[PDB]
TrEMBL record:
Protein name: Uncharacterized protein
Whole-protein residues included: 189 to 323 of 327
Organism lineage: Bacteria, Pseudomonadati, Bacteroidota, Bacteroidia, Bacteroidales
Superkingdom of the source species: Bacteria
Length: 138
C-alpha cells in the first residue's frame, strides 16, 4: 500500500500454529518485514536491527511490533529458518498467498520494509534503516 494509506490487511500463520490477521496485532508501531528465508540481505538487516538499542527496547516493551512475513511458496524452507529469526519478532507465512496474487504490497526485493502507525496507516513505505532510525529516534 502507498504511504499515507491504510496498510493492506492479510492473514498469516506462525510456526506455533497461530493464524491471525495483521490488523489484529495491536501496537503503537508495526514494522512489516517482507523477507525470504534464503536472503543474505534479510540476514544483514536482521543483524543490524538487533544492534540498535532503542529498537531492541521498543521491541521488548511492545511499542514496536515486528511482523516478519514470508510471502512466497517455499513453506518448508520458511519453517526451518523461522526458528532462527530475531527473538521477539512475530514470524509469519502468508499461507493464503494473497499478498502476491493480489499484489497487496509492492515487494520489489527482499527485504522490503514498511513502518505503520497506531491505526495501521503506512507512515514509511519501502523504507531503509537510516530512515527508520531517524524517524523513530527523533
Amino acid at each position: 500500500s502507498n504511504a499515507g494509506m491504510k496498510a493492506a490487511d492479510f492473514t498469516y500463520v506462525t510456526v506455533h500454529g497461530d493464524n491471525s490477521r495483521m490488523s489484529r496485532l495491536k501496537a503503537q508501531y508495526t514494522m512489516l518485514f517482507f523477507y525470504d528465508p534464503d536472503c543474505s540481505n534479510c540476514r544483514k538487516f536482521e543483524k543490524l536491527f538487533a544492534e540498535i538499542p532503542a529498537f531492541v527496547e521498543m521491541v521488548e516493551n511492545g511499542t514496536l511490533r515486528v511482523l516478519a512475513i514470508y510471502p512466497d511458496e517455499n513453506r518448508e524452507e520458511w519453517a526451518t529458518k523461522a526458528v532462527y529469526m530475531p527473538q521477539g519478532w512475530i514470524v509469519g507465512w502468508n499461507k493464503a498467498g494473497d499478498i502476491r496474487t493480489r499484489q497487496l504490497y509492492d515487494i520489489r526485493a527482499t527485504p522490503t520494509i514498511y513502518l505503520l502507525d497506531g491505526r495501521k496507516r503506512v507512515i514509511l513505505k519501502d523504507t531503509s534503516m537510516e530512515q527508520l532510525i531517524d524517524y523513530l529516534a527523533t
